[PDB]
Design an enzyme around this catalytic site. Structure first.
Site, PDB file in Angstrom:
ATOM      1  N   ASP A 251     -46.206 -26.597   0.998  1.00  0.00           N
ATOM      2  CA  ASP A 251     -45.136 -25.656   0.687  1.00  0.00           C
ATOM      3  C   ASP A 251     -43.859 -26.478   0.541  1.00  0.00           C
ATOM      4  O   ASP A 251     -43.311 -26.954   1.542  1.00  0.00           O
ATOM      5  CB  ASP A 251     -45.020 -24.609   1.801  1.00  0.00           C
ATOM      6  CG  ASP A 251     -43.931 -23.578   1.545  1.00  0.00           C
ATOM      7  OD1 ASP A 251     -43.075 -23.791   0.664  1.00  0.00           O
ATOM      8  OD2 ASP A 251     -43.927 -22.547   2.259  1.00  0.00           O
ATOM      9  N   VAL A 252     -43.386 -26.652  -0.697  1.00  0.00           N
ATOM     10  CA  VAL A 252     -42.278 -27.573  -0.954  1.00  0.00           C
ATOM     11  C   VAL A 252     -40.948 -26.991  -0.479  1.00  0.00           C
ATOM     12  O   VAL A 252     -39.914 -27.660  -0.580  1.00  0.00           O
ATOM     13  CB  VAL A 252     -42.192 -27.979  -2.441  1.00  0.00           C
ATOM     14  CG1 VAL A 252     -43.490 -28.691  -2.897  1.00  0.00           C
ATOM     15  CG2 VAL A 252     -41.847 -26.783  -3.321  1.00  0.00           C
TER      16      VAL A 252
ATOM     17  N   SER B 227     -35.060 -29.017 -17.363  1.00  0.00           N
ATOM     18  CA  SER B 227     -35.340 -28.037 -18.401  1.00  0.00           C
ATOM     19  C   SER B 227     -34.281 -28.119 -19.479  1.00  0.00           C
ATOM     20  O   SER B 227     -33.106 -28.369 -19.192  1.00  0.00           O
ATOM     21  CB  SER B 227     -35.370 -26.605 -17.847  1.00  0.00           C
ATOM     22  OG  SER B 227     -35.558 -25.669 -18.905  1.00  0.00           O
TER      23      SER B 227
ATOM     24  N   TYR C 195     -31.357 -21.198 -12.031  1.00  0.00           N
ATOM     25  CA  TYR C 195     -32.287 -22.242 -12.456  1.00  0.00           C
ATOM     26  C   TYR C 195     -31.567 -23.369 -13.187  1.00  0.00           C
ATOM     27  O   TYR C 195     -31.784 -24.553 -12.900  1.00  0.00           O
ATOM     28  CB  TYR C 195     -33.343 -21.587 -13.343  1.00  0.00           C
ATOM     29  CG  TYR C 195     -34.364 -22.479 -13.991  1.00  0.00           C
ATOM     30  CD1 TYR C 195     -35.538 -22.816 -13.327  1.00  0.00           C
ATOM     31  CD2 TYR C 195     -34.197 -22.922 -15.293  1.00  0.00           C
ATOM     32  CE1 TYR C 195     -36.500 -23.600 -13.932  1.00  0.00           C
ATOM     33  CE2 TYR C 195     -35.150 -23.706 -15.906  1.00  0.00           C
ATOM     34  CZ  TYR C 195     -36.295 -24.046 -15.219  1.00  0.00           C
ATOM     35  OH  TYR C 195     -37.254 -24.832 -15.813  1.00  0.00           O
TER      36      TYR C 195
ATOM     37  N   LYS D 241     -31.622 -27.200 -11.765  1.00  0.00           N
ATOM     38  CA  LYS D 241     -32.292 -28.231 -12.556  1.00  0.00           C
ATOM     39  C   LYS D 241     -31.303 -29.263 -13.087  1.00  0.00           C
ATOM     40  O   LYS D 241     -31.670 -30.429 -13.289  1.00  0.00           O
ATOM     41  CB  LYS D 241     -33.084 -27.586 -13.696  1.00  0.00           C
ATOM     42  CG  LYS D 241     -34.314 -26.772 -13.252  1.00  0.00           C
ATOM     43  CD  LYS D 241     -35.381 -27.675 -12.673  1.00  0.00           C
ATOM     44  CE  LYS D 241     -36.741 -26.979 -12.642  1.00  0.00           C
ATOM     45  NZ  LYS D 241     -37.796 -27.911 -12.130  1.00  0.00           N
TER      46      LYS D 241
HETATM   47  N1  LIG Z   1     -43.693 -24.454 -18.976  1.00  0.00           N
HETATM   48  C1  LIG Z   1     -42.446 -24.717 -19.580  1.00  0.00           C
HETATM   49  O1  LIG Z   1     -42.285 -24.405 -20.754  1.00  0.00           O
HETATM   50  C2  LIG Z   1     -41.320 -25.365 -18.811  1.00  0.00           C
HETATM   51  C3  LIG Z   1     -40.082 -25.438 -19.417  1.00  0.00           C
HETATM   52  C4  LIG Z   1     -39.050 -26.018 -18.771  1.00  0.00           C
HETATM   53  C5  LIG Z   1     -39.225 -26.549 -17.486  1.00  0.00           C
HETATM   54  N2  LIG Z   1     -40.438 -26.467 -16.870  1.00  0.00           N
HETATM   55  C6  LIG Z   1     -40.590 -27.017 -15.529  1.00  0.00           C
HETATM   56  O2  LIG Z   1     -42.010 -27.759 -15.429  1.00  0.00           O
HETATM   57  C7  LIG Z   1     -42.495 -27.562 -14.203  1.00  0.00           C
HETATM   58  C8  LIG Z   1     -43.819 -26.732 -14.260  1.00  0.00           C
HETATM   59  O3  LIG Z   1     -43.623 -25.562 -15.056  1.00  0.00           O
HETATM   60  P1  LIG Z   1     -44.910 -24.549 -15.273  1.00  0.00           P
HETATM   61  O4  LIG Z   1     -44.587 -23.619 -16.430  1.00  0.00           O
HETATM   62  O5  LIG Z   1     -46.208 -25.336 -15.520  1.00  0.00           O
HETATM   63  O6  LIG Z   1     -44.954 -23.685 -13.887  1.00  0.00           O
HETATM   64  P2  LIG Z   1     -46.135 -22.673 -13.352  1.00  0.00           P
HETATM   65  O7  LIG Z   1     -45.446 -21.394 -12.932  1.00  0.00           O
HETATM   66  O8  LIG Z   1     -47.188 -22.461 -14.432  1.00  0.00           O
HETATM   67  O9  LIG Z   1     -46.805 -23.463 -12.049  1.00  0.00           O
HETATM   68  C9  LIG Z   1     -46.013 -23.541 -10.912  1.00  0.00           C
HETATM   69  C10 LIG Z   1     -46.900 -24.133  -9.745  1.00  0.00           C
HETATM   70  O10 LIG Z   1     -46.136 -24.333  -8.722  1.00  0.00           O
HETATM   71  C11 LIG Z   1     -46.924 -23.723  -7.474  1.00  0.00           C
HETATM   72  N3  LIG Z   1     -45.967 -23.430  -6.423  1.00  0.00           N
HETATM   73  C12 LIG Z   1     -45.133 -22.381  -6.387  1.00  0.00           C
HETATM   74  N4  LIG Z   1     -44.436 -22.447  -5.269  1.00  0.00           N
HETATM   75  C13 LIG Z   1     -44.829 -23.536  -4.607  1.00  0.00           C
HETATM   76  C14 LIG Z   1     -44.412 -24.055  -3.381  1.00  0.00           C
HETATM   77  N5  LIG Z   1     -43.435 -23.666  -2.370  1.00  0.00           N
HETATM   78  N6  LIG Z   1     -44.958 -25.165  -2.910  1.00  0.00           N
HETATM   79  C15 LIG Z   1     -45.935 -25.794  -3.647  1.00  0.00           C
HETATM   80  N7  LIG Z   1     -46.344 -25.295  -4.848  1.00  0.00           N
HETATM   81  C16 LIG Z   1     -45.771 -24.151  -5.324  1.00  0.00           C
HETATM   82  C17 LIG Z   1     -47.425 -22.612  -7.988  1.00  0.00           C
HETATM   83  O11 LIG Z   1     -48.467 -21.982  -7.092  1.00  0.00           O
HETATM   84  C18 LIG Z   1     -47.969 -23.060  -9.329  1.00  0.00           C
HETATM   85  O12 LIG Z   1     -49.256 -23.632  -9.283  1.00  0.00           O
HETATM   86  C19 LIG Z   1     -41.439 -26.756 -13.443  1.00  0.00           C
HETATM   87  O13 LIG Z   1     -40.666 -27.580 -12.708  1.00  0.00           O
HETATM   88  C20 LIG Z   1     -40.626 -26.091 -14.584  1.00  0.00           C
HETATM   89  O14 LIG Z   1     -39.286 -25.718 -14.051  1.00  0.00           O
HETATM   90  C21 LIG Z   1     -41.486 -25.894 -17.530  1.00  0.00           C
END
Ligand SMILES: NC(=O)c1ccc[n+]([C@@H]2O[C@H](COP(=O)([O-])OP(=O)(O)OC[C@H]3O[C@@H](n4cnc5c(N)ncnc54)[C@H](O)[C@@H]3O)[C@@H](O)[C@H]2O)c1
Ligand SMILES: NC(=O)c1ccc[n+]([C@@H]2O[C@H](COP(=O)([O-])OP(=O)(O)OC[C@H]3O[C@@H](n4cnc5c(N)ncnc54)[C@H](O)[C@@H]3O)[C@@H](O)[C@H]2O)c1
Ligand SMILES: NC(=O)c1ccc[n+]([C@@H]2O[C@H](COP(=O)([O-])OP(=O)(O)OC[C@H]3O[C@@H](n4cnc5c(N)ncnc54)[C@H](O)[C@@H]3O)[C@@H](O)[C@H]2O)c1
Ligand SMILES: NC(=O)c1ccc[n+]([C@@H]2O[C@H](COP(=O)([O-])OP(=O)(O)OC[C@H]3O[C@@H](n4cnc5c(N)ncnc54)[C@H](O)[C@@H]3O)[C@@H](O)[C@H]2O)c1
Ligand SMILES: [Cl-]
Ligand SMILES: [Cl-]
Ligand SMILES: [Cl-]
Ligand SMILES: [Cl-]
Lengths: 266, 266, 266, 266
Positions: free
Chosen positions: C63-64, C143, C156, C160
């Site tokens: 849990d981060v 992001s 956010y 970020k």
């Molecule tokens: N997908 C995109 O287009 C996008 C765009 C910009 C930035 N990002 C960034 O990339 C990274 C991943 O994005 P994503 O879309 O794959 O997210 P996602 O929502 O698909 O996955 C998030 C993961 O984090 C886990 N998680 C949540 N809370 C947690 C906690 N306290 N401790 C440990 N694990 C936890 C979740 O259970 C999940 O598996 C993030 O940092 C996001 O801000 C993604």
């Protein structure tokens, strides 16, 4: 598998410095490498080095100040190896390190030709086989000097900034053909480095200590792999970007005011 | 007290559009404004506008594709008004809006001449009186297109990116003489805006809605004061910067892909 | 050889989305991957996928939002696989998409914890084994929303952006131990993408067309290799950088104003 | 006519340094200035200086670590002068200058509170009267240290980078009400400068020589006018921008590695 197997790359200015390091790195990843170099001696040396290491390479005498010469090297890549998948616009010709008001128009024209026009010509020539195959990687080179406005390099800073604008333009338009276009700002121990190091015994110490990683760049081991990234499927979702490959120098910057110029004359 | 009292300004392309708005803004702040314009009719019209509003101005026919013409205009400023404290490099000539691979070398040469060389020649000519007086303000104009790689503008994007590199170089070196050099990326209702609005009835509304402030820019009221800032003592500690004056458009950007182009052809 | 052989990586939030794609990419390059995930079901699923593909992996419930939980996960990496060479700070928890003035202090607190504090705690815990071996790669995720100021994401965007400041600080200071620190701004088909695609049937096609490469990102095939680059020797001379891995979206940007909001209310 | 006549400004931390310089500059341009300062002695000093110079001023004891204290100062501005048109988020509290791995969590929490939360709370409180009047100017302060990753300032660099993300977010959303939001990265002879100058006799001269304009910044004469620009109609078409007001220091950067730290330990 090598990251560039069955791909063909053309690297301008690949007889020495960063271009040589990139060409050797590409050869070790399976690419057929065209050494598009004006110096016949060093161009053939790198050609033979890549072959002796088990790679494929062909020296083509090329003068990037001539559009026809660039087009001929591109045709040689396609005719001799079947494609031109990767283009690296690396060649560089220096002008005297003089203050901006001392630069001549001839210096700016020469630098625009050897950096900017060379890149324009090579990109538009390589575009034709890349578009036909719906796969291309274009790796352009600019410099941290474009961002610091480094003293004594006014013409270089102008042309290399233009390269960034061209990089973004081609990335925007040519992505529809799966051609990506990116620019690296490298620092490494090339010809300029050894000239500066020969004249100043403390230059290398200060240059290494100027940056977060505390060391100077090796063309093949430090710049090579970044070019490989931008020449490979690893960067298939990256286009229009600039990347500093410089030990982190872009963070602190560097003060390039020459010793004999006072900081304030008003 | 006007912000530019007892200062002399030269604005290229000041017969219309943003240059006219900047020139009129400068006139109202007390500067003597040289209208360095190739179109005699519009150039004289702006000179007379500034005079009728109580300011000082002189139209000087100037072709910024000619080094001699620029140098002659700089001499005219010093001879007629006693100095050349402020230089605004604004003149612009369009090339056809065509895909990057359809641009010609002639188009890139023309755009490099009218944007980059014109700025280079004018900066180095104005530098002479500015250095002597240990006071100068240079305001260059680039474009958000250099940052988005806007479609159909590849030559423009390249040349205006070069302007940024030149701006930083001169800011770095010429600060020792209290000469600052900055670049503005404006958007406003100029000649290009009204051409586009005439062919598309919804263009103006969509253009205003594209940005955070939700309205289109007025040359004199919206761009003018940003130029005044960079031409005055207010910016005496600001140099080498780029500033967007665009209602916030730089934040969302804009997608410039033409309607008839398929986003993915692979 | 695999690019990450004999290395150990910890990826937070690796049970799904980009974190899952990065962890699977790492496993295929020979890294032993700690799946530091709060969801035990998806975390174990990814652990088992990596093993079934011939790699090494261990799920560790993490849990981060808890410093102690992060520290324990770092200890688990070192105790189980012998080191912790690579840290990827990926975990994400959304807050409601509401106007900036409608965000609550509680939302900002939550996002600062799950993005910024999580990254701070993990970086400082992983620093200890990385320093000991004088080899480290830290990959942070920010992001494009931080650069466009995307509507409805104000908390956010703030957290970020903080990540970028922290990335540059650690890159500056920790390069002396051969620890590099870089940040990726990705876009891919994660949990948010599929939520939006379920609520809008034209969302996917419009999202793909919004960018130069004209397609949406796959976590494993498009983001994975960029993380591998920043986790490997290939990036040994790159630190403190931000890289967009987004099909080129950063060039045109995107207008995120909600449909029901009038662009101009003055 | 002053550039801020009939406008009301609240400046946090305006008892000294840049805040004092901005407050005095604002008073000379006709603004009513609320000195929102925790030090009663210096806050009242600046109040009296503005009044003695012919301006309008009110010291309000304010602790920017308290949301209620910030809200009360905003209410006092509106009640006592009729509006709150301009907000300047300037207050600063230092943490020990220690290596990143030696910073404590408590230091990051403290800096996030005094920089980021203070700005968040004040922006959202001032939003209410600004929205009602459809006119607002928010000027946030960040730092070049966020861009260089300056040594020993890791917590400050993180919080001030967050400020940039918050600045862009509010600019994007609040432009519809004619509220602009911009951030300045200043350098000037504030409290930190005089501490460094007192401990090292060569610091001031080296600091001045480190930048293109070759001199150190005066809070009132050098930073003040940039804040006036961003607080006035002159910037009516500028929002979401970052501007360095630092004598050009952003171009060369600066190397902040402490004297006794080895550039390379591997
Ligand atoms: N997908 C995109 O287009 C996008 C765009 C910009 C930035 N990002 C960034 O990339 C990274 C991943 O994005 P994503 O879309 O794959 O997210 P996602 O929502 O698909 O996955 C998030 C993961 O984090 C886990 N998680 C949540 N809370 C947690 C906690 N306290 N401790 C440990 N694990 C936890 C979740 O259970 C999940 O598996 C993030 O940092 C996001 O801000 C993604
Ligand atoms: N070395 C650095 O620290 C550094 C820093 C910033 C930018 N760069 C850029 O990286 C690239 C390579 O730099 P380098 O230091 O390795 O240069 P270099 O001087 O070591 O080598 C330049 C190569 O280009 C060849 N060449 C010269 N003119 C040519 C022409 N008309 N046609 C074809 N080839 C020609 C030269 O013979 C030589 O082999 C350049 O674009 C440079 O501007 C390098
Ligand atoms: N208007 C915008 O939205 C916008 C956007 C981005 C960048 N810019 C830049 O702002 C500046 C002005 O833009 P604009 O839209 O007002 O342009 P414009 O077309 O309305 O005016 C251009 C002026 O330049 C004059 N000119 C042309 N060639 C000349 C020459 N050789 N010598 C002297 N004068 C010459 C023209 O006669 C004309 O008066 C340009 O540099 C432009 O690239 C404008
Ligand atoms: N001076 C520089 O060179 C420089 C460089 C980079 C960034 N900045 C930024 O500019 C701004 C001002 O810098 P400065 O050097 O003038 O600072 P300073 O130390 O000289 O003044 C700080 C002011 O804030 C007051 N203050 C402290 N805590 C407060 C609290 N809870 N509530 C209200 N007031 C409080 C102080 O009493 C003081 O009057 C800061 O945000 C700083 O981060 C300054
Ligand atoms: Cl180097
Ligand atoms: Cl506009
Ligand atoms: Cl995507
Ligand atoms: Cl200073």
């Amino acid at each position: 598998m090598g990251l560039l197997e069955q791909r063909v790359a053309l690297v301008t200015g690949a007889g020495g410095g960063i271009g040589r390091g990139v060409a050797r790195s590409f050869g070790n990843e399976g690419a057929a490498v065209i050494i598009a170099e004006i110096n016949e001696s060093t161009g053939r040396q790198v050609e033979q080095e890549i072959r002796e290491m088990g790679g494929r390479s062909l020296f083509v005498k090329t003068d990037v100040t001539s559009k026809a010469s660039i087009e001929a090297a591109v045709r040689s890549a396609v005719e001799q190896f079947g494609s031109l998948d990767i283009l690296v616009n690396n060649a560089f010709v220096p002008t005297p390190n003089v203050l901006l008001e001392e630069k001549t128009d001839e210096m700016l024209e020469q630098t625009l030709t050897t950096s900017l026009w060379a890149t324009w010509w090579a990109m538009r020539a390589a575009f034709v086989p890349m578009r036909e195959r719906r796969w291309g990687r274009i790796v352009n080179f600019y410099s941290i000097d474009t961002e610091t406005g480094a003293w004594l390099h006014g013409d270089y800073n102008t042309a290399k900034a233009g390269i960034v604008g061209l990089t973004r333009s081609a990335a925007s338009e040519w992505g529809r053909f799966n051609i990506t276009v990116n620019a690296i700002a490298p620092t490494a121990m090339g010809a300029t480095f050894f000239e500066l190091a020969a004249k100043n015994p403390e230059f290398a110490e200060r240059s290494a200590a100027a940056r977060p990683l505390g060391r100077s760049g090796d063309p093949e081991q430090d710049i090579g792999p970044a070019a490989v990234f931008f020449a490979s499927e690893m960067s298939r979702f990256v286009t229009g970007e600039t990347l500093h490959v410089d030990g982190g120098l872009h963070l602190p910057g560097y003060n390039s005011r020459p010793a004999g110029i006072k900081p304030r004359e008003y």
